Each structure stands twice: as structure tokens, then as C-alpha cells.
């Protein structure tokens, strides 16, 4: 058994461990999330595909249970460990209290195994940072993130990856209430998110929308194709 | 006590195992031996000399059987070699608690290679400083195979390890085909052997072990004598 | 071949008066058709303001107090007062059931006060069952004591009969005669009688002679 | 200093400069002086605040009903060896049924506190500890140190600004072996004036009293029951 | 080059309790004050964006019915010492029937805070408060990365602690009211902190001999901002 | 006691006391408590030396680090 | 440097240093000799009094393993009493499973091999103590050992442990302790540290004696007061 | 025989050294300082000098004459929490 603390403190007070695997996410590809009264509405960008490949074993969102959707960032092989752990304790939850799990518990068992992580013996911490999208019983659309460090956090609407500050700073000056009056007119703050982000003018996006009964519906790129079209025109009219 | 479980061996900047590298020069300085396999069985030929003659040549053997029908030669150093072949002594009889059958040399190869590959990754070891040579005549047809301390494996027709082995290399190109006697593959044996020794290859100065369809054995100085006789 | 029990009698008695809580028992260790000595009481001070009267398995008996004992201990130097009379209960009853699979043959009775200086009286079943009674009397004649404390001190299947409460006075004559005749027709119930009274002054002591076959 | 890292490394003068770094450690904490007469052990600490309105740090314990410490140091660790203290004095007491004696009791502490101190990344204990007690022999003044080294003595002071206070215990202990109770205290109270600035001395709320005696439980004295014994002191001579 | 996690300095103390000590500076600051009428406990938030949440966070949680607290420093980490707090409670109830008091809630944490090491692996960035009302009364606690506790009267903890510290120490006095305990503190905050105060960006609660612990939310809240 | 000569040393001393709290100095840094106490005593003008002088040349003379570090014992 | 961290690693000429370190610390320690009359073996420490709050009788460097060993160590204490303890656990399996009182070739070797045990790896460092072993039996004499940090261990007539280590052993030589019986010793025993140790490295010190033989009938105790006063009365005529 | 210490300003160092390196630059009456120091916890004087030229900067940026509060914020994120990467101190903090 290797017994050796990796995250130690520094001498000014910081985890460096912890904020080294920070900026791995900082430059994974780029996953935008905003969340409607009634749909929520979530899709990453840079789907960089080289026409070569199977394009449904290259898939960044994946479900946890029917209701509780989950993109992310970093790099991909610590992901896909945290959902299938993820997809044990709601199925877990299942066989104890009979609910389906709400998705403010699911964000808890994912960050408080991230936390311990970041403090067991010979463990680098994990190198991702999530947005957990789910409509819950009684039917309020609400999504999260998580932090490597381990700090889950609700949002309204939020953005992670390589240039992920630049879209934040651009979904304050565009979110209003109006923005998610219809469940295409949410769709069209998306489309005009990451638009202004890393180019993936059509083809490197991929949205994904729930209508809180439904499961997940990834609309092909022929509704896209007609989404972006009316999205630059209208602004290819009032400019 | 414990251990360390932490591997000393990691990759470079330029990827590649740098201990594994250091390991392959240990195997360069070593004694030189050679392998042949011909069409009947494999003779292995080695070169053993005493530093003084205070040491009794009689007492230690560098060829040494695995089963009734596998020998097992090396070219490295001493004490790393009598471990994995009491390893390889060992491997050979699960296999025959369970079949009830002598092991194909193939499979012996399969496991002790694995035991290498095994000791190079661990916690806190350094690998191996030894290269082998396996022969054995199952169904009918021999084998040759050479392992390294990295723990892959190969199938020679005829091949050298120890020093000087890329001039034994080129030598058995010019001479190895494929039909040959083992008697006549012993008489090259020595004649690559000869390339590399001092001037007097007496019949305790080298060490030959054959197989044949009768199994291995290994030679006792009174013939081995006889081919040194009319030699060269 | 080795039976790991055996049964070496005795008889305690509490009783919960209004400011004061008496319990009592008998002094005979024995076991078999012998006499192992005439001085064995079962009145422990616990604290000074509780007692606990412990009977059975007498190898058992001796143990469990002990454990006891560490643990009031444990509970002071953890947190800076003793321990109240419904906490030892508390207490005891996660003790007597964490050997469920292998049980102390051991009746118990708590006796003492409460917070407010009114007296308590809880008793146990060899697993680590209690609630809290007026009186109780467990041991060897437990079924001989029990109905004549019904109708004296809990006034049942009486008819105009008056409802005053038991004084001080009137308990100690009440269980100095109780044992006089659960002597005569018991075997096991001893020689003298160990009374211990408390009150909210402290724990008085009092000893009884009886008959001694 | 290479040879300044871990417990186990000797250096080249023979001197493990880990040990001695945790002689460093009680050396901060504030001052307490135990002595003992023919009949009695009394020890006396010397509490310390952060605020004016935050409380101040306790340092006597009780271990037993004959035994108690006084602590100097990091407190977690006081903590670690205080419930080893009672753990060991309480099944002695479950086993033979007899007070456990003192002399007994620090032997092991001592192969206690020796085992980190020679493993790896293994820090030591700093830990101050006075011990005052009772054998079948009369009373006993033990002190420890993070080197795992217990002492025999009759008076002593250990943390912070502490060697003042034994210049005073040497010059006094020729009368230590007859008072009473009283002035036993009081030659003990003169010790922590000394160590103290020229200005505050005892106020009433930031020093505390044990006492154990022959016909006597160990008891704790605090801020209100310390002003009978801490009246009957002259003024500072200046 | 490189220490090990378990080592001690020239001048003695440690280093890594001693950088966590140093990592409590980063955090939100909260105020505690004990009042004989009962505890009030107060914090910020330190809202990073307009799309955030609000409520999501939290620094006041309850550990039992009648002992709340209040977290600084990390944050992901202090959860872990709840979790333990609110066990230890449930087993204090559990075997003896009672209520735990408010001091021995405090060492049955210090215990675990000190325990790292490469056996059996580095010490809590987090420094907490305990308010509460045990038979004693209203009482007040504050603990340590180093696992060092202390009843306190009035104490700041966060990134504006010694100046807000300086500025209790002349108001405080121990006869206070619960009423005016719950002004003054807000009067520490409005200057310590970044942004305006408001009804979003700071909450408050209060645990009271009478009824159990009770955190105030944004309707009850505000009639304390706008008579301030 | 050799280099205390040319100060005006009130009898408050104990070098016995004095060599017992200076452990590990050399012949230097002896000397060197010497110079920092005589220095002290002329920042609060006194002129006459006394016991805490020499005490608080000591802390000077081993170079501590003052880290706020009270919360002990 | 770097060859002498640990004491898993040899020097490049091929000597160990953790354990020559080690050694270093021991002579700081003050003095412990042991001399083996005729007919039983006599201890002997000279303890420093550090100061006079110390109580007259604490700290013995002077331990008592068996009913019939002795234990005189030198070195950092808190590894003496450590090596005491297993020394005394081991003569406690010697008895409990064969049945009769352990000799002291193989106790001394049992002890030896515990200490040569630390000198091997890196997560352990070696002991800072040497010491003595004596005692006597009815069958077979008196005996007398000594064991180094290295841990070898060797016989000895007359041995010295502690700051002067040869300015001990330099008049052990001129007694004659192959005739002398175990009385005349004690004296002799204490003159030959009232040489040592200048009054001006320390004020004051104690003497301390320890003593086995078939005199004290084979048991190991200290010696009474009234025989180290005798030596104590033969300490101020080694100034003629 | 001195060994003069220099560590890094506590709090009201830092609140020190900003009212030096800002007396001679056109700024908003109406800011304060001491809450800029509470963001800069383990900070050097140098890096405190770097922050009052920084936003002065942001005025110049845009075109007006005298700094805001928000400019010496938009400073110190760029300067404390952006520049984090390289710091200079923590590995000199224990003078390796």
C-alpha cells in the first residue's frame, strides 16, 4: 500500500495539488448550461470531430438516472469513473427511501467524494468540474456545478472549460426573464452563447434539451442548422 | 519490516525505460554463450572459466535442467540467475499438478517472462541482470527462445548473448542453415565459441547441453573432450 | 459437562417514596443445598443519591458492577458532573443488551433520586428491558413480595379505603415485615437484613437480623 | 542542516535535532511549579487569554482520585497522553482493585512517548507534564519531557520564563520538608511572581491550585476558592 | 528539500498546522456574540456573480436542535466535521437519553482535528463556532485547525478578524440584550465587508433557553437593515 | 563575567543563573549578550544594568522567529 | 556528502555512519565501569547531580533485568530503559518455556541481535546506548558482557562505559580481580572514580553501587549503606 | 551580530504601504484602502506597488482622469489572483 500525503498545504495557505487540477479543466472543452421555467437546456461545444469516427462513443453528457442529466470538463478518463460511481449511489438510493434521487443529493455525493479524495493517501485529486442539470418531483428545474476542490453551487445559468470566463461575462449582460419565455427562445441564449465563444459555427455544437418529463433529446444537426440560420437572422437584420 | 510500493522505474522525457537500458548493459558483460537448434535438437554452448585454479569446476553448473526434457542456459550475472530458476523449477510442476503432462516450452517461456515483466514494474526492486536461452523438444519438433530482463520473448534459429554476441551473430549467418545434425550443430557451437575465449578451451573451460526426442541431458567432460578433440 | 451458569439466589426490594427511595435485600450467598457465607449484601452506592441492587448469577453480579463503576467514571472526566439516576438507566440498558447472544443472568433495580429530589425506581429483565415503577422486588421471592406491596402500598382490590401516601415512617415497618415472612417459606431468603435509605442527604445503612436456617 | 528533517536521522555530533525541537515547544507555554511537603504535593499553574473577554486556558486535569497533571504545550497532544493517563489508571483499578501507584504509572508513559521517537515520520509528543501523586510512600513531583526522559524531583517549574522560578526553589527548600498546607502554598505562590513582569501578578482569574494530601482527595481550586489561599501574600519589593 | 507532513520547526511549533492557521485568512468573516438573553450568530456570504444562487450557500448550520454553528476558512472540508458533530450527538442521545452540552460537543470534534499522518493526511482549513443553550446556559466556543478550543464572549473569524475584533471589544459589555446584540453586530459587518449589505448577502440565527435554534430568513430579516 | 566588567552592573546578578539559561553560545555569542543588554538599558535610559536586561539580550542574540504563536499550554 | 542520511546505505570505503554516530553519543553520557571479582561481579556509576531540586535517588542509570542480571547502562536514557524492558521480556519467555533461570551467553546474544536488528534499515535509526550485563550462578560463576550500538557483545574481566572511557580502564588493570573476593572490591571499585571527573567540570556527584555474588546468595541488589559509606570513607586518601 | 527579520506587513503594514504608493496619483476621494488589504493576505510590498501602477492603467485604458474603487478591484485580481502562477514567495517563504 503506497502511503504518501500528495495534498499538502502550502506555506502561504494554499492546496497547490487542488489548483493545479483547476486549470486541467481550464483548458477541457467548453460546456454551457442555462436552465428554463419548464426545459432546461444544456450543450457543450467543440465536439471537434475529425469525420472519421463513431460519433456516439465521443459523448460528453450522459444520463445518471431518467431525470438527472450531466455534462463536464477536464479530461475524460477521471469522468467517466465519477458517473459510473454516481450511477451506483442513485441506484442505491432506490432500494432504500423510494423516491427517485433528487438532484441536489446526487451533487452532494459527487462533491463529498471529491472532498475526501483531495485528502486521503496517495490520491491526486480529480481533474473535472461537472454541471448537474435535473427537474426534480414537483417540477423545479434547477442545475448545479462542482468544483475539483469539492464545492457544489447552484446557479442560474453558468458556463465551464477553455474560455469560460468570457461567456460568463457574457450571459450577464444577455440573461433576462424574457430570454427563457419560450422553450425555442431558450435555445436561441445557447446558440448565441457559445457562438460567442470557440467558433463551432454549427458543426462542433451539439445541444441537448429536457422538458422535465422527458429523458434526454439531442436534436440533430438539421434543427441546429435551422437554429443558428434564424438566430444570425435576426441579427442580420437589426445591425 | 515493509517495502517501498513505489516503482524506481519510470519513463524519461525521451520515453524510454532508462533501468531497463542499464539492465541490457549488465547482460553485454557477461559471459558469452551461444544456441542452436537443428532439425532433431538444440544444443546450448557456453563459455565457464575459473579465475585461479584453487576453484573447483565441478561444484557449480551453468547449464541446468528445468524438467525431463528443458534446459535453460544464461549470460548476465550469478546470483540473480539461481533465483529465477528455482522460480522456473516451480512453474513447471503446478502446470503438472493440474494436466498431469510435462509443460510445452512455450508456456514455460510464457510464465517466466511474466515474472520478469513483473519485477520490472513492483514496488521498490530493481529488475533482472540476466538474459536466457530455453530449449526443449516438444512433439517432436525443438525450440529456441531467449527472454530479457524487460520480460518480451523471441523464437531463434540460432543466436549468441554475452560479450562480443553481434560477432556471433554474423558468424552464425554465414554458417546456421537448415539441415543440420545436432551433432554437426555442436561442432559449430565451438566453432563460435572459439571466437571469443582464451587460447586454451579445454574440456572444463566450456559447458554443452543438449535435447533430443530422448529429452535433455548435459554433457560430462569425457565427450565433451571428444568434440573439442578435431576441432576448429 | 460445564454448565457456564448457576444460580446462587437472593431477594432485593425497592420501593419510591414522594423524597426518598429505600432499597433493601437479604445477605446469603448460596448455591446448591450449601451455605457459602452469611454476609453478602447487595446494596451498592453507586453515587450518593444512587444505589442499585443487583441479583443472580453471582460471578456476573461482581463483574457487572465494575463495569459500572468505570463508566460513571468516564462520564465525569468526559463532561464535568455525574451522572443523573435516568441516565445510568440510559446506560445500562445498551450494557446488558450488547451481550444479547450470550446474556448476564443478572435482575436489576435502580433506586435513587431524580433531579427534582423525588424518588425513582427503575427495574430490569436480564436482556435490557426497564421502565420506571413505584415499587418492585426482584430475586428468588419476588413472587411472594410483589402482591403484598399491591395492596398496601398501591391500595388495590380495596373498597373505601382512605389514599394517604407512604411516609417514611410507615415504609421502613412495611418492608422490615415483608421480609419476615418471605423468610419462613423461602429457602434461599438469608439471615440479615441490609436496608439502605436514600434520602437528599446522603445514603443511611441499616442492618436487620432474621431467621438463619 | 540536512540532518535536521526527520526523527530517525543521527547527527554527525550524536544530537536528533527533533527531539530537541520539541524542547522548543514547552518551552512556550506558560509557567507552573509543583513542589511537595512530608505530607502533601501541591502544583500551581499559571493560565493564559488571547482576549480580554475570552476565557482562559485550563492547564491542571484530573486523572484519578490521588493523581493529577499539569500540562505545557500544544493542548491536542495533552489530550492524546491525558486519555492514556486515565485509561491506565482506571483498569489497574478494574484488574487488581487498588490505587495504581505513581512511580508505576510514568514508566509507562516513558516506553509510551519512546516509540514515536525513533520510527519514521514519527513526530514526538510535546508535552509538559508535572505529575503529583500518592504511592504507599507519600507524595511524589514527577516531570516528563519530549525526549521520553521522566524525572525524580522535589520541586520543579517548566515552561516559559521557568528558570527564574527555580533560582527561587532552591534558596527555600531547606524549609519545604515541615510546613502545613498553608505555606506550602504560598512558598509555591512566591515562585510565580517571579516569573512574571514587574507590573501584574495575581489576579485572581488567571492562576490555579491542586492539591492532593494524605487524609486528602485531589481537588482543583478556581478563581473564586483560589482568594483564601492567594490573600497572605506581601507586596512586590522594588 | 522537501519536509515531511509531521515535522517540527527551529522555534518548535509545526509547519502545516501553522499554514492552516494561515489558510483561515481567506475565508468569509462571521461574528459571534453571547449574550445571557442567548446567542446570536452572524455571517456573510461573499456572492461571486449576478447568475449565482443565493441560497444555495451556507455558513450557519444546525448540528442539533439546541447547538448551531458557523463555518470559515474552506469550506468543502468543514462538512466533513458536521457530519461528525451531528453523529456524536445522536450517540450521546442514543446511550444516555440526554442532551449533549455544548462544551463536550466541542472536544469530541478537537480530538479528530489533530490526527493526520502516513499510518492507518493533512490537518482541517477550517475554524468553526459553537452556539448554543446546554443547562449552563447560552454558551459560545471556538476551535482551531490546530484543535485548540476556548469559550469566547465575542469572537470574529474570517478574513476581517482582527479588525473587527478591535471594533467588539469597545461595545461589548455582559449585560447585554438579545435586541440590541443582533444591532450591533450588523454595524460590524456594514463595514467590513465588500458590497452593501442587504437581505442577500449576510444571514443571521439565534438559539434561546426558550424556544430551540432558530435561523431568521429574508422576511424577518430586513426589519433589522432598515432600522439599523 | 569578563566582558560585564567596563558596565555598571548593579548586584542583581546571578551568572550561575545567567550561564544556566544561555545553553549551546560559544565565547561569542557570550560576548555578544553583553553588548545587546548594554544597549537596552540606554533605549529605556537606565543606566545601571539588571537581570531582565541580560534576559532580553538573549532573545535578541538567538534570532527567534516571532510568529503570534501564544496558543499553548 | 548524502552517504550517511540513512543506515540502509554503506560509504563509497564501505563503513556505515548512522551507527558511528551513534556511538558519538555515547561518550557524552558520564561513566559506567563494571569489574567480576572471584566470586561475583560489582557495578559501579558515578551520577552527575545537574541540580540540587533533584531527589536523592531518581533516575538510576542502574536497572535490574533478572532476579539474577544486572543492567549498568550509558547513553540517551529514554533508549536505556527501552533495552531494559526487552531484556527483562526476554529472561520472562526463557523461563515461562524452559522451565529455568536464562544464562548469560544466550541472553546477551538475544539482546544483541535486537540491537543489531535497528542498524539495517531506513525506517528505524540505532540505538544511543551502551551497557553491561552481569551476574553470577552456582554452576557457573560470575559472568560479564557488554554490548555496543553496533551490537557486538564480548566477555570481559573489568569494563568502562561513558565519557572516560580509557582513563577508566587504565587503572582497572593494576587491581588484581582474578583473587579478590567481592568485599575488598566495593572499595576499589569507588577509588578508581574519585580520580576521574575534575572538580571543575562538575560541583558535585553520587556515587551509586550495585552488587551479585554468592555473598548476596546469587540475587542482584544494591549494596547497603553502611558498605559504600566504608568506600565513601576510602575517597579523600587519593589525595597523598 | 543583528539579524534583522523582514517579513511580510501584517495588515496595517499593508494599509501602510498603499497609502505611500498612492499619495501621488489622481484617485477617487471616496475609496478605502483597508478593505484592498484584506485581499492581499501573504503579499510584498513590491506586488502592492505593482496594483496602484496597475489601475492606473485602467483609467488610462478607457480615457478618464481619475481612478474608481472597481479599478483598483479589476487590479487586483489581475495582479494577486492572475500573476498566482508564478508568486515568487511560497518556495522562498522556507528559503529553498
Same mark, same amino acid.
Given at each position: ?239 | ?232 | ?213 | ?238 | ?228 | ?15 550561575? =543563573? ?9 565565547? #561569542?555569542?557570550? /560576548? *555578544? ?18 537581570? =531582565? ?9 538567538? #534570532?527567534?522567529? /516571532? *510568529? ?6 | ?240 | ?96
Amino acid at each position: 500500500s503506497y502511503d504518501r500525503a500528495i495534498t499538502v498545504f502550502s506555506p502561504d495557505g494554499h492546496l497547490f495539488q487542488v489548483e493545479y487540477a483547476q486549470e486541467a479543466v481550464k483548458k477541457g472543452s467548453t460546456a454551457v448550461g442555462v436552465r428554463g421555467r419548464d426545459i432546461v437546456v444544456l450543450g457543450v461545444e467543440k465536439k471537434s470531430v475529425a469525420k472519421l469516427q463513431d460519433e456516439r462513443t465521443v459523448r460528453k453528457i450522459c444520463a445518471l438516472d431518467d431525470n438527472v442529466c450531466m455534462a463536464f470538463a477536464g479530461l475524460t478518463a477521471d469522468a467517466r469513473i465519477v458517473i459510473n460511481r454516481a450511477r451506483v449511489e442513485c441506484q442505491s438510493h432506490r432500494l432504500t427511501v423510494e423516491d427517485p434521487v433528487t438532484v441536489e443529493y446526487i451533487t452532494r455525493y459527487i462533491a463529498s467524494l471529491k472532498q475526501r479524495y483531495t485528502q486521503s493517501n496517495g490520491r491526486r485529486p480529480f481533474g473535472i468540474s461537472a454541471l448537474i442539470v435535473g427537474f426534480d418531483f414537483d417540477g423545479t428545474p434547477r442545475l448545479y456545478q462542482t468544483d475539483p476542490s469539492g464545492t457544489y453551487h447552484a446557479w442560474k445559468a453558468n458556463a465551464i472549460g477553455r474560455g469560460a470566463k468570457s461567456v460568463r461575462e457574457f450571459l450577464e449582460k444577455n440573461y433576462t426573464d424574457e430570454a427563457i419565455e419560450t422553450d425555442d427562445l431558450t435555445i436561441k441564449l445557447v446558440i448565441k452563447a457559445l457562438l460567442e465563444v470557440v467558433q463551432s459555427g454549427g458543426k462542433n455544437i451539439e445541444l441537448a434539451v429536457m422538458r422535465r418529463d422527458q429523458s434526454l433529446k439531442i436534436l440533430n444537426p438539421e434543427e441546429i442548422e435551422k437554429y443558428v440560420a434564424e438566430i444570425e437572422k435576426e441579427k442580420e437584420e437589426n445591425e | 519490516e515493509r517495502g517501498y510500493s513505489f516503482s524506481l522505474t519510470t519513463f524519461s522525457p525521451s520515453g524510454k525505460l532508462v533501468q531497463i537500458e542499464y539492465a541490457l548493459a549488465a547482460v553485454a558483460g557477461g559471459a558469452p554463450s551461444v544456441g542452436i537448434k537443428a532439425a532433431n535438437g538444440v544444443v546450448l554452448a557456453t563459455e565457464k572459466k575459473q579465475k585461479s585454479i584453487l576453484y573447483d569446476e565441478r561444484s557449480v553448473h551453468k547449464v541446468e535442467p528445468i524438467t525431463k526434457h528443458i534446459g535453460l542456459v544464461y549470460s548476465g550475472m550469478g546470483p540473480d540467475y539461481r533465483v529465477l530458476v528455482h522460480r522456473a523449477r516451480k512453474l513447471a510442476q503446478q502446470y503438472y499438478l493440474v494436466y498431469q503432462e510435462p509443460i510445452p516450452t512455450a508456456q514455460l517461456v510464457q510464465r517466466v517472462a511474466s515474472v520478469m515483466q513483473e519485477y520490472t514494474q513492483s514496488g521498490g526492486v530493481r529488475p533482472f541482470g540476466v538474459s536466457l536461452l530455453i530449449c526443449g523438444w516438444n512433439e517432436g519438433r525443438p525450440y529456441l527462445f531467449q527472454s530479457d530482463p524487460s520480460g518480451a520473448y523471441f523464437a531463434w534459429k540460432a543466436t549468441a548473448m554475452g560479450k562480443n554476441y553481434v560477432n556471433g551473430k554474423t558468424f552464425l549467418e554465414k554458417r546456421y542453415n537448415e539441415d543440420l545434425e545436432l551433432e554437426d550443430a555442436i561442432h559449430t557451437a565451438i566453432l563460435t565459441l572459439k571466437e571469443s575465449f582464451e587460447g586454451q578451451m579445454t574440456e572444463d573451460n566450456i559447458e554443452v547441453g543438449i535435447c533430443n526426442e530422448a529429452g535433455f541431458r548435459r554433457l560430462t567432460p569425457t565427450e565433451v573432450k571428444d568434440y573439442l578433440a578435431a576441432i576448429a | 459437562r460445564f454448565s457456564p451458569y448457576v444460580f446462587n439466589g437472593g431477594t432485593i426490594l425497592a420501593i419510591a417514596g414522594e423524597d426518598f427511595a429505600i432499597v433493601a435485600s437479604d445477605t446469603r450467598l448460596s448455591e446448591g443445598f450449601s451455605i457459602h457465607t452469611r454476609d453478602s449484601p447487595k446494596c451498592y452506592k453507586l453515587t450518593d443519591k444512587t444505589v442499585i441492587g443487583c441479583s443472580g448469577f453471582h460471578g456476573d453480579c461482581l463483574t457487572l458492577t465494575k463495569i459500572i463503576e468505570a463508566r460513571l467514571k468516564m462520564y465525569k472526566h468526559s463532561n464535568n458532573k455525574a451522572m443523573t439516576t435516568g441516565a445510568i438507566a440510559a446506560m445500562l440498558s445498551t450494557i446488558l443488551y450488547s451481550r444479547r447472544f450470550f446474556p448476564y443472568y443478572v435482575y436489576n433495580i435502580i433506586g435513587g433520586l431524580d433531579e427534582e429530589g423525588k424518588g425513582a425506581v427503575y427495574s430490569f429483565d436480564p436482556v435490557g428491558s426497564y421502565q420506571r415503577d413505584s415499587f418492585k422486588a426482584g430475586g428468588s421471592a419476588s413472587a411472594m413480595l410483589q402482591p403484598l406491596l399491591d395492596n398496601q402500598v398501591g391500595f388495590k382490590n380495596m373498597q373505601n379505603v382512605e389514599h394517604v401516601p407512604l411516609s417514611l415512617d410507615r415504609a421502613m415497618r412495611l418492608v422490615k415485615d415483608v421480609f419476615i415472612s418471605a423468610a419462613e417459606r423461602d429457602v434461599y431468603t438469608g439471615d440479615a437484613l441490609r436496608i439502605c435509605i436514600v434520602t437528599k442527604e446522603g445514603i443511611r445503612e441499616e442492618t436487620v437480623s432474621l431467621r438463619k436456617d | 542542516n540536512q540532518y535536521d528533517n526527520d526523527v530517525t536521522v543521527w547527527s554527525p555530533q550524536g544530537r536528533i535535532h527533533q527531539i530537541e525541537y520539541a524542547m522548543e515547544a514547552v518551552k512556550q507555554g506558560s509557567a507552573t511549579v509543583g513542589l511537595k511537603s512530608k505530607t502533601h504535593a501541591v502544583l500551581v499553574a499559571l493560565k493564559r487569554a488571547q482576549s480580554e473577554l475570552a476565557a482562559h486556558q485550563k492547564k491542571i486535569l484530573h486523572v484519578d482520585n490521588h493523581i493529577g497533571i499539569s500540562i505545557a504545550g500544544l493542548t491536542a497532544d495533552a489530550r492524546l497522553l491525558c486519555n492514556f493517563m486515565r485509561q491506565e489508571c482506571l483498569d489497574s483499578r478494574f484488574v487488581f482493585d487498588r490505587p495504581l501507584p505513581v512511580s508505576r504509572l510514568v514508566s509507562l508513559i516513558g516506553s509510551k512517548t519512546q516509540i514515536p521517537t525513533q520510527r519514521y515520520g514519527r513526530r514526538p509528543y510535546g508535552v509538559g507534564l508535572l505529575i503529583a501523586g500518592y504511592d504507599d510512600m507519600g507524595p511524589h513531583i514527577f516531570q516528563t519531557c519530549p525526549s521520553a526522559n521522566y524525572f525524580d524531583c522535589r520541586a520543579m517549574s517548566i515552561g516559559a520564563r521557568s528558570q527564574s522560578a527555580r533560582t527561587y526553589l532552591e534558596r527555600h527548600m531547606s524549609e519545604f520538608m515541615e510546613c502545613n498546607l498553608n505555606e506550602l502554598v504560598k512558598h509555591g505562590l512566591r515562585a510565580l511572581r517571579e516569573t512574571l513582569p514587574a507590573e501584574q501578578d495575581l489576579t485572581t482569574k488567571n492562576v490555579s491550585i491542586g492539591i492532593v494530601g494524605k487524609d486528602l482527595e485531589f481537588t482543583i481550586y478556581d478563581d473564586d476558592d483560589v482568594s483564601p489561599f492567594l490573600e497572605g501574600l506581601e507586596e512586590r519589593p522594588q | 528539500y522537501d519536509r515531511g507532513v509531521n515535522t517540527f520547526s527551529p522555534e518548535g511549533r509545526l509547519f502545516q498546522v501553522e499554514y492552516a492557521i494561515e489558510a483561515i485568512k481567506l475565508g468569509s468573516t462571521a461574528i459571534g456574540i453571547q449574550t445571557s438573553e442567548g446567542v446570536c450568530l452572524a455571517v456573510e456570504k461573499r456572492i461571486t456573480s449576478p447568475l449565482m444562487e443565493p441560497s444555495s450557500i451556507e455558513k450557519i448550520v444546525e448540528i442539533d436542535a439546541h447547538i448551531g454553528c458557523a463555518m470559515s476558512g474552506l469550506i468543502a472540508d468543514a462538512k466533513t466535521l458536521i457530519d461528525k458533530a451531528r453523529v456524536e450527538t445522536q450517540n450521546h442521545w442514543f446511550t444516555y437519553n440526554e442532551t449533549m452540552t455544548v462544551e463536550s460537543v466541542t472536544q469530541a470534534v478537537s480530538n479528530l482535528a489533530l490526527q493526520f499522518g502516513e499510518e492507518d493526511s493533512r490537518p482541517f482549513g477550517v475554524a468553526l463556532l459553537f452556539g448554543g443553550v446546554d443547562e449552563k446556559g447560552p454558551q459560545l466556543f471556538h476551535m482551531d485547525p490546530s484543535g485548540t478550543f476556548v469559550q469566547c464572549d465575542a469572537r470574529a473569524i474570517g478574513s476581517a478578524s482582527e479588525g473587527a475584533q478591535s471594533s467588539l471589544q469597545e461595545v461589548y459589555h455582559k449585560s447585554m440584550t438579545l435586541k440590541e446584540a443582533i444591532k450591533s453586530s450588523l454595524i460590524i459587518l456594514k463595514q467590513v465587508m465588500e458590497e452593501k449589505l442587504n437581505a442577500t448577502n449576510i444571514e443571521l440565527a439565534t438559539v434561546q433557553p426558550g424556544q430551540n435554534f432558530h435561523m431568521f430568513t429574508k422576511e424577518e430579516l430586513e426589519e433589522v437593515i432598515k432600522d439599523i | 563575567q569578563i566582558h560585564s566588567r567596563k558596565m555598571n552592573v548593579s548586584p542583581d546578578v546571578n551568572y550561575e =543563573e545567567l550561564a544556566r539559561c544561555t545553553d549551546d553560545f560559544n565565547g #561569542a555569542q557570550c /560576548k *555578544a549578550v553583553c553588548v545587546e543588554a548594554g544597549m537596552i538599558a540606554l533605549r529605556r535610559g537606565a543606566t545601571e544594568l539588571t537581570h =531582565e536586561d541580560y534576559m532580553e539580550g538573549i532573545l535578541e542574540v538567538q #534570532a527567534k522567529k /516571532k *510568529a503570534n504563536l501564544q496558543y499553548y499550554a | 556528502t548524502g552517504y550517511d542520511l540513512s543506515a540502509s546505505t554503506f560509504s563509497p570505503d564501505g563503513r556505515v555512519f548512522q551507527v558511528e554516530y551513534a556511538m558519538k553519543a555515547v561518550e557524552n553520557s558520564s561513566t559506567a565501569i563494571g569489574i567480576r571479582c572471584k566470586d561475583g561481579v560489582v557495578f559501579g556509576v558515578e551520577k552527575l547531580v545537574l541540580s540540587k531540586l533533584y531527589e536523592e535517588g531518581s533516575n538510576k542509570r542502574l536497572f535490574n533485568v533478572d532476579r539474577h542480571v544486572g543492567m549498568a547502562v550509558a547513553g540517551l536514557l529514554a533508549d536505556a530503559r527501552s533495552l531494559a524492558d526487552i531484556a527483562r521480556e526476554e529472561a520472562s519467555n526463557f523461563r515461562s518455556n524452559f522451565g529455568y533461570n536464562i544464562p548469560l551467553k544466550h541472553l546477551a546474544d538475544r539482546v544483541a541481535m535486537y540491537v543489531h536488528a535497528y542498524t539495517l534499515y531506513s525506517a528505524v535509526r540505532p540505538f544511543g546506548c551502551s551497557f553491561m550485563l552481569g551476574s553470577y550462578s552456582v554452576n557457573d560463576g560470575a559472568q560479564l558482557y557488554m554490548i555496543d550500538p553496533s551490537g557486538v557483545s564480548y566477555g570481559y574481566w573489568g569494563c568502562a562505559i561513558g565519557k572516560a572511557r580509557q582513563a577508566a580502564k587504565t587503572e582497572i588493570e593494576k587491581l588484581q580481580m582474578k583473587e579478590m573476593t567481592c568485599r575488598d572490591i566495593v572499595k576499589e571499585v569507588a577509588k578508581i572514580i574519585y580520580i576521574v571527573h575534575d572538580e571543575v567540570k562538575d560541583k558535585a556527584f553520587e556515587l551509586e553501587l550495585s552488587w551479585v555474588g554468592e555473598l548476596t546468595n546469587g540475587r542482584h541488589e544494591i549494596v547497603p549503606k553502611d558498605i559504600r559509606e566504608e568506600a565513601e570513607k576510602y575517597a579523600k586518601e587519593s589525595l597523598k | 551580530d543583528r539579524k534583522i527579520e523582514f517579513s511580510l506587513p501584517d495588515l496595517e503594514g499593508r494599509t501602510h504601504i498603499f497609502k505611500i504608493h498612492a499619495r501621488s496619483m489622481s484617485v477617487e476621494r471616496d475609496i478605502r484602502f483597508e478593505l484592498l488589504a484584506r485581499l492581499c493576505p501573504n503579499s510584498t510590498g513590491a506586488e502592492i506597488r505593482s496594483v496602484c501602477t496597475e489601475a492606473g492603467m485602467f483609467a488610462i485604458r478607457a480615457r478618464r482622469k481619475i481612478a474608481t474603487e472597481k479599478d483598483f478591484l479589476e487590479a487586483v485580481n489581475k495582479v494577486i489572483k492572475s500573476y498566482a502562477k508564478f508568486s515568487a514567495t511560497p518556495r522562498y517563504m522556507t528559503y529553498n
